[PDB]
């Protein structure tokens, strides 16, 4: 019954496409047409963190908006003091091929994972006065692409085996597995309520998952190549994705479709990282051109450019207070913009 | 007070910097190698007191287009070749012409020369106008029946390698051994140093 099942699957996709087209009465650009432009945005490199040896794949801001962790392929996990540029921790990793890092939203733990297929949890606040591997989460059959703490005892990880997993750090077991992607899940972002999360994979598709139930709610397909980056809007009702097709796109959870595309003819490089500002008015995206573009989220205009890195911009983040933007790059430097 | 604890924060940074210098020594003195044919296996060997660290991917899916970008600042990629041959020809084409792998050298091991001697003309109906290049040296005592096939396979890989001048990468074909990787990494680093001085 392969033909019939494929025949049914192509009658539901057209039903979904017709349903989405019915709700598309006026575009986002038509509604924010009569809004004041953001204007030219000048951000300057306020800090430059110069400790890492190899290229940097990931960084993650602390909830206090002062400390941040960064992961580099030399086999190091450095925790920075963004205000004083002082290194607080330098954590050597068992495997040097690390592709992601997360910072617990309590300052207590940091996570990292890579080609070793393991998410390693590191305890920072222990009476022993040193950072040790709190846990090693094994069970993914592909490299770890992203990880985000839900609390001190829950962490969600995306893998290069086309699955996302929810873990119980105390027991070191997968509480839930999220399947349905056909390519390598490259990134994930948690909703502000940590009840949902979106993930983008190497199939030009983004999926909205329910953390508690373990099921997919919605699938978003607007891109043409692999989705490298994903991030929720601050409101939680929308998210933005960056892909290899040199475009960033904004999706709406309630409208279940696309709102805006953030692209220009001069960009033919893929987006590696995306993030919003505190109000969601600016969308910051890193590119393979070694530069980060600032976009007017409601206007799709390029508000500004962060152009201080000598190599591919790999990671990018905005503090919880919105005071600064930190970008990492393959030139082994972290720069803070404000 | 802030001053008293800022001394401790500067002291903690200073201890890290002293260790990060010891880590920098071993990082630059180590030659990383991607052996391409747990989620990754590491092989430790040293030749003439030079540390080589060779990484073989393990539990990874056959879609390499993402995790292979982690191996661009590697010293060389060890490519082992046993239509299986055209599949390895297309994979070497991908690595050679990659945006991020166009500065990475490829040490190419054309393996299975012992079974190749035991037994290709159907997969490549151009291996009928090809004759052993006398510019290269054959192995004495062996008929030109298998050396013609050995050099034909090498010339298919050298057709790819020589077509792209976009990057600072060199291909090193071989016939299958530990010293060959050492000698070729010696040539890779020298060619890189000679390029900083504009001598090459």
């Amino acid at each position: 019954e392969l033909d019939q099942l494929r025949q049914e699957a192509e009658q539901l996709k057209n039903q979904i496409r017709d349903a989405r087209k019915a709700c598309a009465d006026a575009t986002l650009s038509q509604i924010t047409n009569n809004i004041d432009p953001v204007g030219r945005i000048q951000m300057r490199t306020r800090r430059t963190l110069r400790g890492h040896l190899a290229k940097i794949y990931a960084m993650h801001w602390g909830t206090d908006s002062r400390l941040l962790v960064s992961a580099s392929q030399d086999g190091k996990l450095i925790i920075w003091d963004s205000y004083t540029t002082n290194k607080v921790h330098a954590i050597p990793l068992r495997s040097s091929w690390v592709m992601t890092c997360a910072y617990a939203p309590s300052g207590n733990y940091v996570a990292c994972g890579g080609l070793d297929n393991i998410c390693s949890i590191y305890n920072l606040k222990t009476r022993e006065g040193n950072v040790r591997v709190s846990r090693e989460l094994a069970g993914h059959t592909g490299y770890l692409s992203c990880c985000r703490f839900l609390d001190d005892n829950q962490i969600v990880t995306s893998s290069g085996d086309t699955t996302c997993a929810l873990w119980d750090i105390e027991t070191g077991q997968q509480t839930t597995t999220f399947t349905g992607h056909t390519g390598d899940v490259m990134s994930l972002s948690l909703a502000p309520d940590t009840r949902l999360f979106v993930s983008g994979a190497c199939d030009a598709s983004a999926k909205l998952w329910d953390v508690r139930e373990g099921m997919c709610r919605q699938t978003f397909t607007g891109h043409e190549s692999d989705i490298n980056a994903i991030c929720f809007f601050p409101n939680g009702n929308a998210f933005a994705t960056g892909s290899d097709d040199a475009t960033c796109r904004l999706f709406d959870l309630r409208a279940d479709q696309e709102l805006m595309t953030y692209s220009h003819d001069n960009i033919i490089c893929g987006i590696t990282s995306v993030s919003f500002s505190k109000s969601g008015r600016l969308l910051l995206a890193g590119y393979d051109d070694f530069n980060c573009n600032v976009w007017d989220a409601l206007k799709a205009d390029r508000a500004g450019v962060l152009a201080g890195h000598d190599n591919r911009v790999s990671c990018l983040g905005v503090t919880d207070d919105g005071m600064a933007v930190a970008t990492g790059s393959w030139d082994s430097f972290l720069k803070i913009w404000n | 007070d802030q001053r008293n604890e800022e001394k401790a924060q500067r002291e903690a940074n200073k201890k890290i910097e002293k260790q990060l210098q010891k880590d920098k020594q071993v990082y630059r003195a180590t030659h990383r190698l991607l052996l391409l044919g747990s989620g990754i296996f590491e092989t430790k060997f040293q030749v003439d007191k030079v540390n080589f660290h060779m990484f073989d991917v393990g539990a990874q899916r056959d879609e390499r287009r993402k995790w292979i970008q982690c191996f661009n600042d590697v010293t060389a990629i060890i490519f082992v070749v046993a239509n299986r041959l055209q599949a390895a020809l297309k994979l070497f084409d991908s690595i050679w012409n990659n945006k991020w792998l166009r500065d990475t050298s490829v040490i190419l091991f054309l393996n299975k020369q012992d079974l190749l001697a035991e037994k290709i003309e159907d997969y490549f109906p151009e291996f009928a106008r090809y004759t052993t290049p006398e510019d290269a040296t054959p192995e004495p005592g062996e008929d030109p029946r298998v050396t013609r096939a050995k050099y034909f396979i090498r010339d298919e890989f050298l057709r790819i390698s020589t077509a792209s001048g976009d990057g600072r990468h060199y291909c090193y074909p071989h016939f299958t051994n530990i010293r060959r990787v050492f000698n070729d990494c010696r040539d890779i680093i020298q060619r890189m140093h000679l390029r900083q001085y504009e001598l090459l």
Partner: nanobody
Amino acid sequence: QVQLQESGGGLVQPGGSLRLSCAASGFTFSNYKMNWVRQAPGKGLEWVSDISQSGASISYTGSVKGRFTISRDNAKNTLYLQMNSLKPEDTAVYYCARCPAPFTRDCFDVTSTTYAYRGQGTQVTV
């Protein structure tokens, strides 16, 4: 979304002509290298031919070189494979595969694991 649908194929006597068409949608056709791959019964996916973004750099696998012809209509968003003198070894499911990224001379698209930018395939019996 990125959709690749192949047409043509079926039973043909040893020899004869069989033309494959690949209708593409969900992406800008002219920005990608396009590939042809097949999976013979009892064998894995095998690369057959490719054609560049413009149609200048055309490549084939040796076993079919001189018999098959690949061509793309960038205006019509369609890919072709004119197969001439079909041998019985050419019996396979032929997949129209798109290279993962645009403006790239690089492709990783013969993986048995689900490659997103590959089509459904069409049976070709010789």
